[PDB]
Amino acid sequence: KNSKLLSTSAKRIQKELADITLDPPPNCSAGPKGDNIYEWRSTILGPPGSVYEGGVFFLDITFTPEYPFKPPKVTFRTRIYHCNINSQGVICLDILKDNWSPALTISKVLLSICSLLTDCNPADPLVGSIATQYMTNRAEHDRMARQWTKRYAT
Numbered sequence: 001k002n003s004k005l006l007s008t009s010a011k012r013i014q015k016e017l018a019d020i021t022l023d024p025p026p027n028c029s030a031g032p033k034g035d036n037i038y039e040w041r042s043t044i045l046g047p048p049g050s051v052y053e054g055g056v057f058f059l060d061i062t063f064t065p066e067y068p069f070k071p072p073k074v075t076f077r078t079r080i081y082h083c084n085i086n087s088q089g090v091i092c093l094d095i096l097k098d099n100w101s102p103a104l105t106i107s108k109v110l111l112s113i114c115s116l117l118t119d120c121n122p123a124d125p126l127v128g129s130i131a132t133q134y135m136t137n138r139a140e141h142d143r144m145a146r147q148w149t150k151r152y153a154t
Helices: 008-022 106-118 128-136 138-152
Strands: 028-032 039-045 056-062 073-076
Touching: 008 028, 008 106, 028 106, 039 106, 128 138
Parallel strands: none
Antiparallel strands: 028 039, 039 056, 056 073
């Protein structure tokens, strides 16, 4: 193939790969799994000071062919006890749903995920039982979250 004919989504993803190589978000890395620019993995170390500290979390990231005009699909592959992340690893984050903009980048998405790990949104939960426990019994929520981090993410 003549690289002069690379698609606009492939060129944009390559630029975001360079960006994230030179200046990754704290406690994050991400890039293509292999030779397909549209299929990435990310590693997130649980934020220090949070209930996820010591955990190593793996995420799958898939870019669509019309990137940056649709958000990437980002899922957790490691189990995590968090009221905005379900058992299938789906992430309830508005910029991945109906509030995406083409000025956002995979680095900003990963920054937002890290912020969500440290500060969840219990009023828009994917896992209602966890949101309720966060609200009514935060100390037991945190015990559980640290237990799952040790059991499933170390």
